[PDB]
Every structure is written in structure tokens, then in C-alpha cells.
Amino acid sequence: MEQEKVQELVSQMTLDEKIAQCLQLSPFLFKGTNKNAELTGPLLQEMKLTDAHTENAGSVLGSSSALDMIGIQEAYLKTNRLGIPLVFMADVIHGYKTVFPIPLALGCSFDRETVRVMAEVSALEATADGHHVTFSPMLDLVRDPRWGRVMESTGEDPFLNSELGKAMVDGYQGDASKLNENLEQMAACVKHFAAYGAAEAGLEYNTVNMSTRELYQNYLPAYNAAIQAGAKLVMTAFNVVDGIPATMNKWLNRDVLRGEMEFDGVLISAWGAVAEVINHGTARNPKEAAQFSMEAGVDLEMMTTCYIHELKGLIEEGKLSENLLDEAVLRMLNLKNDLGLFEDPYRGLKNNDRTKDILTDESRGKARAAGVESAVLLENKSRLLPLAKEAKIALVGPLATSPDILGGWNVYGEEKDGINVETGLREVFETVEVVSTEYTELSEEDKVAVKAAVQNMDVVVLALGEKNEWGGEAGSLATIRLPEAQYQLAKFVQTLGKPVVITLFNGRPLEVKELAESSDALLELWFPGTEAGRVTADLLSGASNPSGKLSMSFPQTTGQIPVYYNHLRTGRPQTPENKGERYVSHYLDIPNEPFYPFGYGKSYSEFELKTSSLPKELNLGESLHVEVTIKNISDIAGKEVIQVYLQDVTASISRPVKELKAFEKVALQAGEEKTVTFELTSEAFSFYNHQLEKVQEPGLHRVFVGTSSEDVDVFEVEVGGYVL
Amino acid sequence: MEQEKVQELVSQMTLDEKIAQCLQLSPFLFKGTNKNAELTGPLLQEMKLTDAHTENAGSVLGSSSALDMIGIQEAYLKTNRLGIPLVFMADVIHGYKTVFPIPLALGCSFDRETVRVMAEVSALEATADGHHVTFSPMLDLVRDPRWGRVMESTGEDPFLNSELGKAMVDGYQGDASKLNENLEQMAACVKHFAAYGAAEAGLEYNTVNMSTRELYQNYLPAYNAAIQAGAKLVMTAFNVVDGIPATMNKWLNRDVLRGEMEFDGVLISAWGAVAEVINHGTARNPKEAAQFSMEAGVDLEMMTTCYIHELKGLIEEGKLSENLLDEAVLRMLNLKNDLGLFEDPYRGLKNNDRTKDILTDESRGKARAAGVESAVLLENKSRLLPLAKEAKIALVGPLATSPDILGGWNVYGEEKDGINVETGLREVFETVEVVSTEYTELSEEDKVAVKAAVQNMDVVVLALGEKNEWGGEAGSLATIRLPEAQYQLAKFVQTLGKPVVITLFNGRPLEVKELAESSDALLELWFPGTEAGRVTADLLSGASNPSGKLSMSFPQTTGQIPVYYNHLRTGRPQTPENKGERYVSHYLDIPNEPFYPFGYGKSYSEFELKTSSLPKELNLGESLHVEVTIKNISDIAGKEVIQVYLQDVTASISRPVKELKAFEKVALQAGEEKTVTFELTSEAFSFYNHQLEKVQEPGLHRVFVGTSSEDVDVFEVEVGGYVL
Ligand SMILES: OC[C@H]1O[C@@H](OC[C@H]2O[C@H](O)[C@H](O)[C@@H](O)[C@@H]2O)[C@H](O)[C@@H](O)[C@@H]1O
Ligand SMILES: OC[C@H]1O[C@@H](O)[C@H](O)[C@@H](O)[C@@H]1O
Ligand SMILES: OC[C@H]1O[C@@H](O)[C@H](O)[C@@H](O)[C@@H]1O
Ligand SMILES: OC[C@H]1O[C@@H](O)[C@H](O)[C@@H](O)[C@@H]1O
Ligand SMILES: OC[C@H]1O[C@H](O)[C@H](O)[C@@H](O)[C@@H]1O
Ligand SMILES: [Mg+2]
Ligand SMILES: [Mg+2]
């Protein structure tokens, strides 16, 4: 409907209707929910919610199904005075019912299209079940794998995260201005604004601190990218940003988000984060929490009652302008309007059961393909992999049969529909003997059984990993290791003298030196999702060729953290020259390098890259165009991820030794050759200076071209002269 | 001499003379040295230093003795045109030849007078050997035990570090305006400006990043307090501060140091830190390193050649003002003048041999007292300690006979003058049997010998520890554990069925949980210095009663770092009333609490504390007077550390749950009672807001009074009304 009628609606609302519009509740707080209705009475009572609140609430979070949505919207619209429908929002993080790999795994694909397709399918299914908005993408830069939420991020690189964040928004939303017409797409909500992944000691919800320059340089760029790509909502972070909880941080949300980033959509709090500013010690009570959060521009309070119980009195007493309330309501109404809810409050569902669009075979094939793009081959000594389909396999370990392969943040998918490693393996390999072990134990009985199976077969697929519950939100591990019984199992298996592949399932970087050294191959599957078993079986048989690269460094040990490729040089770098000398930047007990670096992964193919002649000089403002010719020189078809880095050798700020500025995943048949070309704009050479200005300075840059952050060729370009 | 004559000197020096005055060299680069003359040739060659440079250099660093000094000074004055004597600087960190406990142990004393006396004796002796300046105190806040240099700090608390810093300045310098007459006092040099102990991942020299607010709040106050108390010099830090190497950080050194802190003495570089700005990637070559460091106001280049090889070109080409050089040179001459060097270049030594003032018995007694103040009793089950003088002791481990107990940053002290554990114990205990073991090994033959000594004896003193080379500068450990052999030794000893006291020697917090569980008593001696085994024997026997408290938290495990008492609350604090809820700030695998908290230490005595009735309300700017009555209620004379903390419950910035604001160690005979009073000025209730203003806000504060950061009674004070 027309903008004018949207405006009119706001004019017509009472003050109480306006306040309620800024409240979001679980489905079972509303009349006509078809699930958990026994909870309704007591919680309404605990939260001191009346019908006058629930009949005017702005939004539903976490509806269980189309029929939950429909019953709630129907009952709600019966009693709503002006007919403003509810907006329904959900956590669709890496799939709805067809579960794709965890976002950290998606990061490892280095494949924009893989990520878009993931998001497209997620929206196809989520819309089919009544959801209008997804709390995705999560764009928090991560350097600390102790934090359970690394699984939701695409990793340690701001550029990769930006690029995949855009892909995700494009997949969920399609053309953002046609969300009223395209009812299989949904609104995206960027999260968590901002810097949440810098949680101190990887402890959930803990303190975040960094200089403002760093915040701009590395922590804000992906949120910005996704916002500039049309992301419709943004969500607050639980953490302080420089001393002030993000939810009430006016500078952060008014000056930066709404001001500099020109975001004009709904700002939703993370769960309870409006009330939680009290806990943080920056509000004395719910009245202050409400006032400060409204001041900061938060439109929608998620499952707490500060606004609902406090705004009226604040406005009447002149401590808050009703104008700020009107701006929030308008933002909420426009989102509803963008989603087409004023013409159709059931968003396509009403005469049209879309059950059939959920968990199709086509969709499953897409999740499988994503899993195969995303896995990372870390070790393959003497071409153990791929296995011949006649290979006789001992399949041992906690991940041999565990159905827990869908990943954390899997709110709607069901393990009943997943494919476990055994089932997947038996579809490919004729001879499989299985010995399941527990996640945290290794008994003498297990050892006996494991030895019998290994003696019978030719190769060992040792399937290890994490329960998903050991990560995700409030899954913080102080030590980034598997249960010790699993490292023991790997030691034991190695003594039986048969070749061993370790297939590892997990949500975070782990200490894997001991695994790499106890096995001949190591394949990192992360949590691939619904098709986990077949993803595993196709990579192992070579039906698919591993092509993933690490989007986050794998530390030598927990104590090395944070370790990350785009690090500063220091005043005393360790060189190949000065190595062994005491007075340089080093540890006494480990190397400086992570165990596996950013951009690293193996293939069953072999590849050859050559960069075309580059200019020696460039003007300021001028682009560098990089041409790379890549050949597959093997008999095996595969993909390689070409990566281009830039270094700023000397600057007014100490700059990282490398930064990713372009990448493209290239498919080549055996002997096939291609040429890809990259443009590094003058923005790629620029950075934030000590006055917070975004600047390009003349001087030397290095350009690195290759297939990891460490396997590269290096060129020099001197920028100076005049400005384009 | 009179200031005009000092200004006359600046006016008469040639440009080359002024440049060279800003250079500092090792002693053997000068004619007249009496040690290491074989290094002189090649190093002059490598550094391209001529006679014209060395005959006009400003300063000597690390003279080897009074003779080295006299020879160098005397030859230098023969040839120096205007008669400007050399200033001699050295690292006197926790003692000269009488070695006192490492500064981190001195933090655990909580005793300002111990710290002043340590500095006083250090100056007595160092001046006796011809040193004019010491590179102490080290005032870097530390929260990360991986970093080797925690040994040089007094710990994780700004207030403690501020107070002991002033004590140290006071002890080295006495009345600063009389350093020209008090020739047994010497100048102090605060280091390292600024924030060096925040090195990322505990790695030597690594990146530091925090917000400007946080820098002011926690990282700057100790440097500030030492400077306000009159510290004559300041030294730059190796690390970046918000992206810019401290050495060439104009804002830091001109605006904050010289501007806000009003510091008008000599700014000396860390070792090589001027040239190293090149490696940091913020200067392209020595000419730039020279220009930027001089712009930032560094007066004295430590052992690199940027200034001497480049300043003439920079001044001649007018890229740098000669006035900046004249003010550096005037600062250098003012220091020399302040030390009385223009009346007496030999600073009291020329016809006065002061060997007699070195390593006196009185000084050894002071070092022993300091050791027994600083040690921390961590466990003492069933009153194992103190031992009877007739207890039969098996003394086992790598620290049983080891002479390495002087500590890191011991540049002049000698192991042969130190007292080891065995020697200390045999002065007190009639029956000791000793089995020495290696630091990193546990052999079968060791176990047999340990078993034999233990079977014979009644109790075991298990002496474990680090070698001092495993910390100090560029002694970073990713895992903060002893060698595994030592844990294995503790495990083994425990099986022998005799009571065990572990005496631990070390330069950092370590993972001691396994040691606490493997023994009946655990005594943290850190490294006590010259009197190490007498410190150890007096504490174990009861002749002294342990009184030290941790000034740094002891983590559960490496992966809990950073963990510190003065932490923020977060939005989702774990409370005793949400035990076991998933969605709160916690780890899955360890407690949130450190294994041992700040302010913790046991005693052979028992004390009771009673806080006098406090006001319920206070005005802004008003002090709070806190009166505490303490009684020793046991039969054993002993000392306790009364600690007062403050919390700002609600603020415009999220404030720590507690901060220490007063402390006093109280000595009490059996049954004796004392009252002490503390004034918490309004400065104690103030903080840096998001605008970087030092503010006091009206509102609620809590006052905690007790004997650790966790053993406290709590009171409430509402601040407001009018101001003063
Ligand atoms: O850390 C041991 C593992 O190292 C992998 O190589 C990764 C990366 O290491 C350096 O940066 C090299 O310069 C670069 O060429 C490498 O790609 C090995 O491939 C693993 O087998 C090792 O386990
Ligand atoms: O209680 C707070 C927490 O509640 C849970 O029910 C939600 O899923 C969490 O994501 C939320 O952060
Ligand atoms: O090479 C540089 C290093 O050499 C040693 O002689 C110094 O005492 C160190 O503190 C210095 O940082
Ligand atoms: O953290 C565990 C420790 O807590 C301390 O406060 C106790 O004094 C110790 O005996 C105990 O080992
Ligand atoms: O040895 C002189 C100085 O060398 C280095 O600059 C160290 O950082 C410093 O702590 C020491 O005082
Ligand atoms: Mg540059
Ligand atoms: Mg307050």
C-alpha cells in the first residue's frame, strides 16, 4: 500500500498501540498458537502481559510451523483495531528443513554462489512455513575459536565475510524492493551489531574492547557491505562496545549505523538485550533501560518488557520525545509494507499449502553440493585418497553412526532426515565394517572390537568430532580440543599398521596436530548438514574432489590464540635470517605460525598459476587489474581457489603483512586452462588512519597471487603521482 | 651549576655535537673501557661509528663496574671539547648485587615500605658501582601470564601498581631535587610507555590494541603516578599503541606524556626501538625513523644509529627543526646537571671507594625480609605448616639444589652469593635428605632415589620451578605450565604416603591445580633473590609467618586467559541463582573463577575484621573514611592485608565489579588488636567516560572490606547532592 496510508496509520494509533508495536513475543504468548499453549497463562503472568499488550504486539519470534503462524495471525487480526498484521521472524541460519553446512564451513567453500543458493533454498522453505524474516547473516569477525559462535561466522577475514555476507543477503532477499511480490524470498537481518566475536577469552557474552580505528578497519566492514546490499533489518549485540552495551550505544546505533551506514530499517535487540543493559551496569532499572535503548534507536524489543511497561510514563513525563516512538513504529510498519502484509498478511500461504517445497530431492542435492564445496582436505599423504570403491573399510569412532551431523543453530531440521556416515558410506563402498565408540570414553572392549575390524579391512575411516552442543551460543571451550579419549583412539588406531583417514566433524577450529600426525589423511567436514554421510562418501571415493580452504587459522595450541593471517609485523619479526635468536617475537615452546593457515586446502588435482605482467607504478585512485592464468596439469577434474592479497609496506599506521582483496573459485577439467581477471580498486589500497579518515597514501604495495595466504608469488607496485 | 651555564652549553655545541648527545652506547664502544675490548672493533665498524661520534655521545648503557665507569668517563673528558660528562644508565630491576624478589613477588607483599627499601638498597649499591640512572620501575599492567615480562610488573591492578611504583621511585631517588647532593640515590626511569603488557597472545613484542578510554582507565595510571611523584626519565615501549609504534607516537609522547602528564625529562628509547619503527612498517628507512622519533620527542636513541647518521641531513634540508634537537639536548644536560655531574662527573666515587656498601649483611637481611613478605601461602591442609625444627625432611626436585633462584632481570647479581634451598633448610632443620632432579626429566633412577629418601624421612619438601630463562624479556610461553615431568614428580611423590609441602619457584602464574591436588601445602616463593633458601626455611619452620597475597590471578587453565578480579559484569552474569542454565556467561569445561583470585594468601594466624559504621550517603567530591578494626585471634604473631574495594553499580560506562582503592598490611601479636582508617577520596569514585573526561557521577557505590577480592564484607553508599 501507498506510503501515505502507512503514515496515516501511525497518526491513528494510540500511544499504547505504538508502544506495543515495538514488542516481539514467542508464539505461545498469543491466542491461537497451535503449540505449547500450556505455557501461555503462566508466562503472560510472569511478564505481566495483558491482552491489550498481546493484541497490539509488533512481532512473533520462532513460530513452529505454517499452522502456528496462520492461527496466530488470524486470531490476532480478529481483535486488532486497525488491522496491522504481525511480522514473523525466525532463526534460519544455514538451512530450514534441508540443512546445509554451518556458516564457518560455507566460509571454507570460498564460493559466493554456494552461499547464495544456500540462502535461496533456506528462504524457499522458511516462507513455505510462514516466516517473513531471518536472523541471518551473522557477520561477526572471529579470531578466537574458544567462542562457540565461530560456527555462525565465515571466519577471520573481513573481505571474505563481506563478500559472502552479500551473497547471503542476495540469496534470502532477491530484489529487496520486490519483497511484496516475491513471496519465496524473505527479509534478512544482519547480526550482531557490533564486534561480538571479540569476546574476551572466548567467553560467551564477555567484554569486547578495541580502539575505534580497529573497529572501523576490521570489525564493521561486513555489516556495512550487507547493509549496502539491502539487508532489511539489523540486530544489536550483547557485548559492550567501548564500555557501552551495544543495545544502548547511541554513537554506535545513531551516529554509525543510521548515520554513516545510512541504515533506515528496523533495529531489533538481541534476545533480552534491552533489559540486560541493567546487568551490564549502564541502566539502574527498566525505566532507564527503555529510555536509553529508545534513544539509541532500537525499534523492537525481543522478549523483554522494558518498553511495554515504561515508555508511556517516559513520554508523559517529558523524559522521552514521542517523536522517537513514531519513527520506530513507522520503521516497523514499512517493513510490514515491504513484505506485502497489508495486502496479504499470510504472505502467499492462505489458499496455497506449500508443504511440497520443503525438503525436496532437488534441495537435498544443493545441500550435498554445498557440503562438497565446503569440506577442507588438510592431509593426504601418498595419495591415500581417493579410496577405490572396492576398498574394504573399517569405519570406527564416535562419528561412525552418530546422527549429530546437522550442526549447531539448527532450529528446524530433524536428525531423522539426515544421512549418517555409515549410511552414506554403504551407498558407495561394498565392504564396510563399523565399530561405534562414545564421544568421551575409550574402553578396553572398544579397543578389542576396533582391532578385530581393522585386521579384517584394508583402510580405516576414523570418524571423530564434537557434539554440536559443545559450540553455538554459550558453548565456550577454554581448551580447543576434542575429548582426550578421541586423541587416544587416534593414537591406538595408528598402531594397527593400516592406512588411516580421519574424517572430522566440528563447529570450530581444534588443536589437530596430534590427529594429523596419527593418520595418513585428514578431511575436515565441519558439520555439512542433512546430506553429511553422502558428502563424506563422495569426497572419500573421489566422486567429488575436495576444494575447500580454511577461512580461519588452526592454532598450534589453545595458548596461541588469537592467531590469524592478517597480522601486524611488530618491531622485531622472526625472519629466516634471525631464527634461533632470543630477542625476536616468538614463543619458547611453539612456532609462530598456526598449524594450518588461512586459505589452505588440498585437492586430488594439481594446478599451475601464472600472473600476467603487472604495472610497476600506479597513480592514486587508479585500479590494479590482475590477470591470472590457471591450468589443471593432472588427470583429475577439480577446483582451485585463486587468492589475491595486498600489503601496504609502509604507512602512517602499522598495516597487516597481508589482506585478502580478491578470490575466485575456478573449475578445471584435466588439462583445462582458464584466465580470470581481478580489479583491485583504490579502495583495496586504502585504510583508516589515526584520525579515523579513510585514506590512500602513496608508496609501495606488495601484491601476492596464489592458492593460500602462504603459497603465493609476490609483485611490487609503487603508487604515487596524481589522483584519479 | 646555574641554568644559564647549561643554556650556554647548548648555544656553544656544534650541530654534530648536539646530534651525538642524543646517542647511547654500550661501554666497550668507548675508549677507556676495561672489559669486552675485543667487541669494540667489529661493532664500531658494523655501526659505522667514528671517534667523532663516541667522543660526543650522550650516554653509557650497562657499565660493568665502577672501574669501567671511571676509565670511560676519564678518557671521555680528556677529549670532549666543552666538558660534558657521560651519564651512565643500567638495569637495576629488583636489586643490584643484593638481589631482592622479582617485582611480581614484590607486588604480592602489598607492602609499600618493602618496596621502597628494595629500591633504596638497590641505589645504595648501584651508585657504589658508578650508575646514575636505573631502568625501573616497570609499570606495565599485566593480565596475561604467557608474556615473560609479567615478572617485572607488580601485577593486574592499576592502584597497586601505582602505589608500589611511587614507593620504588621514592626509594631510588629520595628527594628528587637533591640528586646532586644525595650521591647514594640515583635517577629512576619509568618504563615502558605505554601498555606493553597487553601484548596479543602473550607473544613478545606483539600488537597491543585497546580503546583510548581503556588506555586511560587502566593502562596509564601507574606511569602517571610515578611521573607525578618525580621520576626523572621515561622509556618508550616496543609495541604499537593504536597502530603507531610508541617510539614515534606523537599523540602519546607529546600530547599525553609531555602535555597532560607534564613530563619534562629525558625520553629514552627502548633498545633499538627507534630503528625498529622501520620493521613495524611506519617508517620506510632510518631517515624517516629519525625524523618521526624526534618529532615525537624521543631524546636519547638506545644503541641504534638513526639520529647520528640522519639528523644532519634532516635539519640541513629543513624537514626537521633544529629547535627540536636543542630541546632534547637541553633535557639531557638538565638531567646531567640534576645528578651533579658538572661539579662531580664521578658522582662521589673518584676518591671514595664504596665497595664496602655492596652486598652488606644488613642489605642481605633486608632482602630476606622482603622475600618473607612476598611469598604467598596457597594451601596448608591440616596445619602441615609450619614444620617442627626436628621434622625429618626429604627435599626433592629440580629446585632442591638449583642455584637459579635470583630471578629474571638479574643483570649484576651472582648465583655464588645466593642461598639455595638445601643450604637454607640445613641451617634450620637438623635432618634433611636430598634428591636433586632435572627440570624437564623424570627417570626411573630418580624415582627409586626419591622413594628411598622419602621412606627414611617424615615429610617431603617438593621443590618445583621454572628456570629464569623461561620468562623475562622474550620468554613467552603459549602454555603456562611447568614441564610435564614436574607434574609427574608431584604425582609420584603423592603415592608415597607422606605429607608433602610444595615450594614453587617461578616468574609467572602457572597452572597449579594439579600441584594443589597432589600435595598438602603449597607455598609460592616466586624467585626471592639472594636469600632464597633462608626465605624458604624461615617460612616452612614458622620463624616467619607467610603474609603475601596474589597480585595476579592464577588461571584454571591457559585458555581462561585473560582472567582478572576487576572484570565487567556482562549482560548475563553467572550468579549462584542461575547455576547450570545454558544461556549465561560461562565455559562448558572450566569455572569462570580463576584457580586463585587477586588478594588471596593464607597465614599461620587467624584474624577478625570489623568495619566501623559508614555513612549511608555522601556528597560529590567528598571522601569516604573507612575505619577497620582487626584482631589476631590466634596464638601466632602474624600479618594480614586489609583491602578496600569500590564498585560503581550503575554508570555511563560499564564499570568493574570491584576495584582496589586502599590496602594496608597490619602486623599483630597473638591476641593484639589495631584500628586503621582509610580515606577513599572522590578520585576513587571517578572514571573516564566515553568522551574521555575524568568524571564523578552521582549514584550507588558498594564498598567491600576484607582480606582478598573474594573474602569481603559489603556496604552501600549513595553518592549525590552538591559538590565538595
Ligand atoms: O603445519 C604443518 C602442516 O603444514 C602444511 O602446510 C601449510 C602451509 O605451511 C607453510 O606456510 C608452507 O610454506 C606452505 O607451502 C603450506 O601450504 C602441510 O601441508 C601439512 O602436511 C603439515 O601438517
Ligand atoms: O534466555 C536467553 C536466551 O534464550 C534462549 O531461549 C534463546 O534461544 C537464546 O538464543 C537467548 O539468547
Ligand atoms: O637485541 C636487542 C636486545 O639485546 C639485549 O642486549 C637487551 O638487554 C634487550 O633488552 C634488547 O631488547
Ligand atoms: O580454587 C580452589 C581453591 O580456592 C581457594 O580459595 C582455597 O583456599 C583453596 O584451598 C582451593 O584449592
Ligand atoms: O636494557 C635496557 C632496556 O632494554 C630494552 O629496551 C628493554 O625493553 C628494557 O626493559 C630495558 O630496560
Ligand atoms: Mg604505504
Ligand atoms: Mg554510578
JSON list of N, CA and C in Angstrom, two decimals, chain B residues 41 181 474 543 667:
[
{"chain": "B", "resi": 41, "resn": "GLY", "atom": "N", "xyz": [86.20, -3.13, 18.18]},
{"chain": "B", "resi": 41, "resn": "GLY", "atom": "CA", "xyz": [86.46, -3.06, 16.72]},
{"chain": "B", "resi": 41, "resn": "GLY", "atom": "C", "xyz": [85.33, -3.43, 15.76]},
{"chain": "B", "resi": 181, "resn": "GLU", "atom": "N", "xyz": [73.23, 16.31, 45.46]},
{"chain": "B", "resi": 181, "resn": "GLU", "atom": "CA", "xyz": [73.87, 16.14, 46.80]},
{"chain": "B", "resi": 181, "resn": "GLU", "atom": "C", "xyz": [73.74, 14.72, 47.39]},
{"chain": "B", "resi": 474, "resn": "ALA", "atom": "N", "xyz": [61.24, -11.84, 26.14]},
{"chain": "B", "resi": 474, "resn": "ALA", "atom": "CA", "xyz": [61.32, -12.78, 25.00]},
{"chain": "B", "resi": 474, "resn": "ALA", "atom": "C", "xyz": [61.40, -14.24, 25.49]},
{"chain": "B", "resi": 543, "resn": "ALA", "atom": "N", "xyz": [59.45, -19.49, 61.76]},
{"chain": "B", "resi": 543, "resn": "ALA", "atom": "CA", "xyz": [60.21, -18.36, 62.22]},
{"chain": "B", "resi": 543, "resn": "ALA", "atom": "C", "xyz": [59.67, -17.13, 61.51]},
{"chain": "B", "resi": 667, "resn": "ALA", "atom": "N", "xyz": [50.52, -5.59, 61.14]},
{"chain": "B", "resi": 667, "resn": "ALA", "atom": "CA", "xyz": [51.23, -6.61, 61.94]},
{"chain": "B", "resi": 667, "resn": "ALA", "atom": "C", "xyz": [50.64, -6.72, 63.38]}
]
